[PDB]
CSV table of C-alpha atoms in Angstrom, one decimal:
chain,number,residue,atom,x,y,z
H,1,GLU,CA,71.9,79.3,77.4
H,2,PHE,CA,74.4,79.3,80.4
H,3,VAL,CA,76.0,76.3,81.8
H,4,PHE,CA,77.6,77.0,85.4
H,5,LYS,CA,79.8,73.8,85.9
H,6,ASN,CA,83.2,72.5,86.4
H,7,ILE,CA,85.0,69.7,84.7
H,8,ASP,CA,88.5,68.3,85.6
H,9,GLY,CA,89.1,71.4,87.6
H,10,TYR,CA,88.6,74.0,85.0
H,11,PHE,CA,85.7,76.1,85.0
H,12,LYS,CA,83.8,75.8,82.2
H,13,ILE,CA,80.9,78.1,80.8
H,14,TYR,CA,79.3,76.8,77.6
H,15,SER,CA,77.0,79.8,76.2
H,16,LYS,CA,74.5,80.4,73.4
H,17,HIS,CA,72.7,83.5,72.3
H,18,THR,CA,70.2,83.4,69.9
H,19,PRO,CA,67.1,85.2,68.8
H,20,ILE,CA,63.7,83.6,69.2
H,21,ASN,CA,59.8,83.5,68.5
H,22,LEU,CA,58.4,81.7,71.3
H,23,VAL,CA,55.0,80.3,71.6
H,24,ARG,CA,55.3,77.9,74.6
H,25,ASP,CA,57.4,76.4,77.5
H,26,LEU,CA,60.1,75.3,75.5
H,27,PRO,CA,60.2,74.4,71.5
H,28,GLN,CA,60.4,70.8,70.0
H,29,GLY,CA,63.6,71.0,67.7
H,30,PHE,CA,67.5,70.8,68.2
H,31,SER,CA,70.3,73.5,69.0
H,32,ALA,CA,74.0,72.9,70.6
H,33,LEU,CA,75.5,74.7,73.1
H,34,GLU,CA,78.9,75.6,71.8
H,35,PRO,CA,81.6,76.8,74.0
H,36,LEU,CA,82.9,80.4,75.3
H,37,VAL,CA,85.2,80.2,78.1
H,38,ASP,CA,86.9,77.6,80.0
H,39,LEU,CA,88.6,79.5,82.9
H,40,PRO,CA,91.4,77.1,84.8
H,41,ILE,CA,90.3,78.4,88.3
H,42,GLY,CA,90.3,74.6,90.0
H,43,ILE,CA,88.8,75.1,93.6
H,44,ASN,CA,85.7,74.0,95.1
H,45,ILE,CA,82.7,75.9,94.5
H,46,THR,CA,79.6,74.9,96.4
H,47,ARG,CA,77.1,78.0,96.5
H,48,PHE,CA,76.0,80.7,94.5
H,49,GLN,CA,74.2,83.8,94.9
K,1,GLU,CA,111.5,101.8,131.5
K,2,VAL,CA,113.4,101.4,127.9
K,3,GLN,CA,116.8,99.9,129.3
K,4,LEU,CA,119.5,97.6,127.5
K,5,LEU,CA,122.0,96.0,130.2
K,6,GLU,CA,124.8,93.9,129.4
K,7,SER,CA,125.9,90.2,130.5
K,8,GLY,CA,128.6,88.0,130.5
K,9,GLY,CA,132.5,88.2,129.1
K,10,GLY,CA,135.8,87.4,130.6
K,11,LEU,CA,138.9,85.3,129.6
K,12,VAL,CA,138.1,82.7,127.8
K,13,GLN,CA,140.6,81.0,125.6
K,14,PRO,CA,140.5,80.4,122.1
K,15,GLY,CA,138.3,77.6,120.6
K,16,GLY,CA,136.3,78.2,124.1
K,17,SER,CA,133.1,79.0,124.8
K,18,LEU,CA,131.3,81.9,126.2
K,19,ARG,CA,128.1,83.6,126.6
K,20,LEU,CA,127.4,87.3,125.8
K,21,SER,CA,123.7,88.7,126.2
K,22,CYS,CA,122.0,91.9,125.7
K,23,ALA,CA,118.8,92.3,128.1
K,24,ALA,CA,116.4,94.9,126.4
K,25,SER,CA,113.0,96.4,127.8
K,26,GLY,CA,110.7,98.9,126.2
K,27,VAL,CA,111.3,97.2,122.7
K,28,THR,CA,110.9,93.9,120.9
K,29,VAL,CA,114.2,92.2,119.4
K,30,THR,CA,112.2,89.9,117.3
K,31,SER,CA,110.2,92.1,115.6
K,32,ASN,CA,112.6,95.3,115.1
K,33,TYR,CA,116.7,95.8,114.3
K,34,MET,CA,119.1,95.3,116.8
K,35,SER,CA,122.9,94.8,116.6
K,36,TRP,CA,125.8,93.8,117.9
K,37,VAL,CA,129.4,95.6,117.1
K,38,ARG,CA,133.1,95.0,118.4
K,39,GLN,CA,136.0,97.6,118.8
K,40,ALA,CA,139.7,96.4,118.8
K,41,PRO,CA,142.3,98.1,121.2
K,42,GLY,CA,144.1,100.7,118.7
K,43,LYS,CA,141.2,100.2,115.8
K,44,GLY,CA,138.2,101.7,115.0
K,45,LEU,CA,134.5,100.1,115.2
K,46,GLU,CA,133.8,96.9,113.4
K,47,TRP,CA,130.6,95.6,112.7
K,48,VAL,CA,129.4,92.1,113.8
K,49,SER,CA,125.6,90.9,113.3
K,50,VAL,CA,122.5,92.4,113.2
K,51,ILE,CA,118.8,90.5,113.8
K,52,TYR,CA,115.8,91.8,111.6
K,53,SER,CA,112.1,91.4,111.9
K,54,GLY,CA,110.8,88.9,109.7
K,55,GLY,CA,113.9,86.0,111.1
K,56,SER,CA,116.7,87.1,108.8
K,57,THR,CA,119.9,86.8,110.0
K,58,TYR,CA,123.3,88.8,108.8
K,59,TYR,CA,126.3,88.4,110.2
K,60,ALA,CA,129.7,90.1,109.7
K,61,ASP,CA,132.6,88.7,107.4
K,62,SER,CA,134.4,86.7,110.4
K,63,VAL,CA,131.7,85.8,112.4
K,64,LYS,CA,129.6,84.0,109.9
K,65,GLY,CA,129.7,80.4,111.5
K,66,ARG,CA,131.5,81.4,114.7
K,67,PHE,CA,129.0,83.1,116.7
K,68,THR,CA,125.3,81.4,117.8
K,69,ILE,CA,122.3,83.9,117.8
K,70,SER,CA,118.9,83.3,119.7
K,71,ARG,CA,116.5,85.7,120.4
K,72,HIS,CA,113.3,85.5,123.2
K,73,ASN,CA,110.6,87.8,123.8
K,74,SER,CA,110.0,86.6,127.5
K,75,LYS,CA,112.1,88.9,128.8
K,76,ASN,CA,113.4,90.9,125.7
K,77,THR,CA,117.1,89.0,125.6
K,78,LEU,CA,119.1,88.5,122.7
K,79,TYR,CA,122.0,86.0,123.6
K,80,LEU,CA,125.3,85.3,121.2
K,81,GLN,CA,126.8,81.8,122.3
K,82,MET,CA,130.8,81.7,120.6
K,83,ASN,CA,132.7,79.0,120.4
K,84,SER,CA,136.0,78.1,118.2
K,85,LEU,CA,137.1,81.5,119.1
K,86,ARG,CA,140.1,83.1,118.1
K,87,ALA,CA,143.1,85.2,119.8
K,88,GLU,CA,142.4,88.3,117.9
K,89,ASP,CA,138.8,88.5,119.2
K,90,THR,CA,139.8,90.4,122.3
K,91,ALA,CA,138.2,93.6,121.7
K,92,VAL,CA,135.3,96.0,123.5
K,93,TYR,CA,131.6,94.6,122.5
K,94,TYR,CA,128.6,96.9,122.4
K,95,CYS,CA,124.7,95.6,121.8
K,96,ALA,CA,123.1,98.5,120.1
K,97,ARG,CA,119.7,99.6,119.2
K,98,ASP,CA,120.4,100.6,115.8
K,99,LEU,CA,117.3,102.1,114.2
K,100,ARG,CA,118.7,102.3,110.2
K,101,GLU,CA,120.4,105.5,108.8
K,102,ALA,CA,119.8,108.4,110.6
K,103,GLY,CA,122.9,108.7,112.3
K,104,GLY,CA,124.6,105.8,113.3
K,105,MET,CA,124.9,104.7,116.9
K,106,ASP,CA,123.2,107.9,118.3
K,107,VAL,CA,123.2,105.8,121.9
K,108,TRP,CA,125.6,104.8,123.7
K,109,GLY,CA,125.9,102.2,126.9
K,110,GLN,CA,129.0,100.5,128.5
K,111,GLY,CA,130.3,98.0,126.7
K,112,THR,CA,132.2,95.0,128.0
K,113,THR,CA,135.7,94.2,126.9
K,114,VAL,CA,136.1,90.3,126.1
K,115,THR,CA,140.1,89.3,126.7
K,116,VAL,CA,141.1,86.1,124.6
K,117,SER,CA,144.4,85.6,126.1
K,118,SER,CA,145.9,82.2,127.1
K,119,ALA,CA,147.1,83.5,130.4
N,1,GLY,CA,104.1,113.8,117.4
N,2,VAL,CA,107.4,115.6,118.2
N,3,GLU,CA,110.8,114.1,117.1
N,4,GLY,CA,113.5,113.5,120.1
N,5,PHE,CA,114.7,110.8,122.1
N,6,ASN,CA,112.9,107.1,121.2
N,7,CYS,CA,111.0,109.1,118.7
N,8,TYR,CA,112.3,109.6,115.1
N,9,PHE,CA,110.6,110.4,111.9
N,10,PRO,CA,108.8,107.5,111.1
N,11,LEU,CA,110.0,107.7,106.8
N,12,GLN,CA,113.5,107.6,105.2
N,13,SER,CA,114.4,109.1,102.0
N,14,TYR,CA,116.5,107.0,99.3
N,15,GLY,CA,119.5,109.1,98.2
N,16,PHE,CA,119.2,109.8,94.9
N,17,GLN,CA,121.1,113.3,94.3
N,18,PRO,CA,123.1,114.3,91.3
N,19,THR,CA,126.4,114.2,92.7
N,20,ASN,CA,125.7,110.6,93.3
N,21,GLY,CA,128.1,107.8,91.3
N,22,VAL,CA,127.2,105.6,88.7
N,23,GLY,CA,126.1,102.6,91.1
N,24,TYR,CA,123.8,105.3,92.9
N,25,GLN,CA,121.4,105.2,89.8
N,26,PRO,CA,117.6,104.6,90.1
N,27,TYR,CA,117.5,100.8,88.5
N,28,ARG,CA,113.6,99.7,87.5
N,29,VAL,CA,113.2,96.0,88.2
N,30,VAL,CA,110.0,93.9,87.0
N,31,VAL,CA,109.8,90.7,88.3
N,32,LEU,CA,107.8,87.6,87.3
N,33,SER,CA,107.7,85.1,90.0
N,34,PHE,CA,106.4,81.6,89.0
N,35,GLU,CA,103.6,79.9,91.4
N,36,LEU,CA,102.3,76.4,90.8
N,37,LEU,CA,98.1,76.0,91.2
N,38,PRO,CA,95.7,75.9,84.8
N,39,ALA,CA,99.1,76.2,83.5
N,40,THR,CA,98.4,78.4,80.5
N,41,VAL,CA,102.4,79.7,80.7
N,42,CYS,CA,104.5,77.5,78.1
N,43,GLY,CA,107.6,78.1,76.2
N,44,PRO,CA,108.1,79.8,72.6
N,45,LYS,CA,110.3,77.2,71.5
F,1,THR,CA,118.6,77.8,79.1
F,2,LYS,CA,115.4,75.6,79.4
F,3,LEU,CA,113.1,78.7,79.7
F,4,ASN,CA,112.5,78.4,75.9
F,5,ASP,CA,110.7,74.9,76.7
F,6,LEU,CA,109.5,74.7,79.6
F,7,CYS,CA,106.1,74.9,81.0
F,8,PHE,CA,104.9,77.5,83.6
F,9,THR,CA,101.6,77.6,85.8
F,10,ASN,CA,101.0,81.4,86.7
F,11,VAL,CA,102.9,84.6,87.2
F,12,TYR,CA,103.1,87.5,89.1
F,13,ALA,CA,104.3,90.5,87.6
F,14,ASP,CA,106.0,92.8,90.5
F,15,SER,CA,107.2,96.0,89.8
F,16,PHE,CA,109.2,98.7,92.1
F,17,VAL,CA,112.3,101.1,92.0
F,18,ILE,CA,115.5,100.1,93.3
F,19,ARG,CA,119.4,101.9,93.7
F,20,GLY,CA,121.9,100.9,91.2
F,21,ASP,CA,123.9,99.2,94.2
F,22,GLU,CA,120.9,97.1,95.3
F,23,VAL,CA,120.7,95.4,92.4
F,24,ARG,CA,123.7,93.3,93.0
F,25,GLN,CA,122.3,92.9,97.2
F,26,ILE,CA,120.0,90.3,95.1
F,27,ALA,CA,121.6,87.2,95.3
F,28,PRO,CA,121.1,84.1,97.9
F,29,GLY,CA,123.6,84.9,100.4
F,30,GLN,CA,124.4,88.5,99.8
F,31,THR,CA,123.2,91.2,102.1
F,32,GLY,CA,120.6,94.0,101.4
F,33,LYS,CA,117.3,95.2,103.0
F,34,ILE,CA,114.9,94.8,100.0
F,35,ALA,CA,113.9,91.2,101.6
F,36,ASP,CA,112.4,92.0,104.4
F,37,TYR,CA,110.2,95.4,103.7
F,38,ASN,CA,109.5,96.1,100.0
F,39,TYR,CA,109.7,92.5,98.6
F,40,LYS,CA,109.8,89.2,100.4
F,41,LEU,CA,112.4,86.8,98.5
F,42,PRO,CA,113.0,83.1,99.8
F,43,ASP,CA,116.1,81.6,99.2
F,44,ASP,CA,114.1,79.4,96.8
F,45,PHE,CA,112.5,82.0,94.9
F,46,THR,CA,111.3,80.5,91.7
F,47,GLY,CA,111.3,83.4,89.2
F,48,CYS,CA,113.3,85.6,87.3
G,1,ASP,CA,132.0,98.4,99.3
G,2,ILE,CA,133.2,101.7,100.0
G,3,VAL,CA,136.3,102.4,102.0
G,4,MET,CA,137.9,105.5,102.7
G,5,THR,CA,141.8,106.6,102.6
G,6,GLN,CA,141.7,109.3,105.7
G,7,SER,CA,145.6,110.6,105.0
G,8,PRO,CA,145.7,112.1,108.8
G,9,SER,CA,145.7,110.0,112.0
G,10,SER,CA,147.3,111.7,114.5
G,11,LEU,CA,147.5,115.6,114.3
G,12,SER,CA,149.2,117.7,117.0
G,13,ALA,CA,148.8,121.4,117.1
G,14,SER,CA,148.7,124.5,119.7
G,15,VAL,CA,146.0,126.1,121.7
G,16,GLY,CA,143.5,127.8,119.9
G,17,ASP,CA,144.0,126.5,116.1
G,18,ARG,CA,141.6,125.8,114.1
G,19,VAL,CA,140.7,122.5,113.0
G,20,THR,CA,139.7,121.0,109.8
G,21,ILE,CA,139.3,117.1,109.1
G,22,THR,CA,138.6,115.8,105.6
G,23,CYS,CA,137.9,112.3,104.9
G,24,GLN,CA,138.1,111.3,101.5
G,25,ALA,CA,136.3,107.9,100.2
G,26,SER,CA,136.5,105.5,97.4
G,27,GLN,CA,132.6,105.9,95.9
G,28,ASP,CA,130.1,108.6,96.5
G,29,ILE,CA,128.9,109.2,99.6
G,30,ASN,CA,125.4,110.9,99.6
G,31,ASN,CA,124.9,113.3,102.6
G,32,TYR,CA,125.4,110.5,104.4
G,33,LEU,CA,128.6,110.7,106.3
G,34,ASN,CA,128.4,111.3,110.3
G,35,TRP,CA,131.0,113.0,113.0
G,36,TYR,CA,131.4,111.9,116.5
G,37,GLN,CA,133.0,113.1,119.7
G,38,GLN,CA,134.8,110.2,121.5
G,39,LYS,CA,137.3,111.7,123.7
G,40,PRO,CA,140.3,110.0,125.5
G,41,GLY,CA,139.1,106.3,126.4
G,42,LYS,CA,135.4,107.3,126.8
G,43,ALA,CA,132.7,106.1,124.1
G,44,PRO,CA,131.7,107.6,120.8
G,45,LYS,CA,129.2,110.6,121.0
G,46,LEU,CA,127.0,111.4,117.9
G,47,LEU,CA,126.9,114.7,117.0
G,48,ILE,CA,126.6,115.2,113.0
G,49,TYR,CA,124.1,113.0,111.3
G,50,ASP,CA,122.9,112.9,107.7
G,51,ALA,CA,125.6,115.3,106.8
G,52,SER,CA,123.4,118.4,106.4
G,53,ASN,CA,121.3,118.5,110.3
G,54,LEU,CA,122.8,119.7,113.5
G,55,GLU,CA,121.5,117.4,116.5
G,56,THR,CA,120.1,119.5,119.8
G,57,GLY,CA,123.2,119.7,122.5
G,58,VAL,CA,126.0,119.9,120.0
G,59,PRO,CA,128.3,122.9,120.4
G,60,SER,CA,127.9,125.4,117.9
G,61,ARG,CA,132.1,125.1,117.8
G,62,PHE,CA,131.4,122.2,115.8
G,63,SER,CA,130.0,122.1,112.0
G,64,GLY,CA,130.2,119.2,109.3
G,65,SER,CA,129.2,119.3,105.7
G,66,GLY,CA,129.9,117.6,102.4
G,67,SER,CA,127.6,116.1,99.8
G,68,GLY,CA,129.5,113.7,97.7
G,69,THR,CA,132.9,112.6,97.3
G,70,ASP,CA,134.2,115.5,99.8
G,71,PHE,CA,133.3,115.8,103.2
G,72,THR,CA,134.8,118.2,106.2
G,73,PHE,CA,134.5,118.5,109.2
G,74,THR,CA,135.2,122.1,111.1
G,75,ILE,CA,136.1,123.4,114.9
G,76,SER,CA,136.9,127.1,114.9
G,77,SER,CA,137.1,127.9,118.6
G,78,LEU,CA,139.5,125.1,119.9
G,79,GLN,CA,139.3,123.8,123.2
G,80,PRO,CA,140.9,121.0,125.5
G,81,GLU,CA,137.4,119.6,125.3
G,82,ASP,CA,138.0,118.9,121.9
G,83,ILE,CA,141.3,117.0,122.1
G,84,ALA,CA,139.6,113.6,120.7
G,85,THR,CA,139.4,111.2,117.7
G,86,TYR,CA,136.9,112.6,115.1
G,87,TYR,CA,135.7,109.4,112.8
G,88,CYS,CA,134.0,109.7,109.5
G,89,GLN,CA,131.6,106.7,108.6
G,90,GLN,CA,129.4,105.8,105.9
G,91,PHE,CA,126.4,104.3,106.2
G,92,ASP,CA,125.7,103.8,102.8
G,93,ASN,CA,127.0,100.7,101.0
G,94,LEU,CA,126.5,97.5,102.8
G,95,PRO,CA,128.6,96.2,105.1
G,96,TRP,CA,128.7,99.7,106.8
G,97,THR,CA,132.3,99.6,107.6
G,98,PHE,CA,133.5,102.3,110.4
G,99,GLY,CA,136.1,104.8,109.8
G,100,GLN,CA,139.4,104.7,111.5
G,101,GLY,CA,138.9,108.6,112.4
G,102,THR,CA,141.9,111.1,113.0
G,103,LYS,CA,143.1,111.7,116.3
G,104,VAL,CA,143.7,115.5,117.5
G,105,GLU,CA,145.3,116.1,120.6
G,106,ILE,CA,146.6,119.8,121.9
């Protein structure tokens, strides 16, 4: 899981790495996305490739 | 083609305004070194002022605030208006295209004297 | 590509020679220039 | 004096080598040659 | 600041005598002194730059040398055209003050 967003100027990426045993589209359950990186970029980003 | 001609000079009184000027052709005063220098009678040469590339003005000790320098690329000219002069300022002045440190003042012109006598 | 009038060697060399005095010794300089944009630098004390 | 308890945003580390007599030429009002071609130093140079 | 205390200012000699010019400096000049020919009343003309290289046009009767505190200028074949004032200049320490120069007249 990756979260691509800018909050309060800081470009914050929260990621989550896990092994799975997948059976369908998305499982029914719960799992949080703990923070990994909070880069103080502080610019406006609108497009990505 | 390339030429540095001199204009100005006379018998201005101390504290009296005068205009010396060096008109260049073939170079660019704004983005290259150029300098003005005096030579006192009976004394060796004395450095006066330089214009550099990048809007940085440097003067000598005695002409820090007494001369006013302004440059134009329309005719490639440098002007120094001198006010609040002193009697000692009588000397032969030159404008030179100094090229850093490879032999100082390799090229010479004529140079114009300035007499600041009260007569 | 030739030397002469109005055509001098483009580069000049710093005068570092053994005969040079104390004041002409090579000084290496590192400059920390501070700019403001995200302030991750503070004081230890 | 306040460097020990002051907040800074970002730094640029700029390294070079000059002559010994050129170190004292680094001063607002002093003359020199570094300020125009090798390193640009404003008269309000915010740095050390 | 570098200032030169050159002892000779005006020396007189007969025709054909050697010309030896010594210019001492307060601090060390690093291969960075010049020798000119200025002539009576005329504008200075640069002959020796960077203390070791000769310029195209300078007569072979002129020689300049020095790397450090000591600097020497030598003229072996004395001529009436050599009646002039030879200057030593240091383009080394800002500000680049000029020298006084020794005047040789024969």
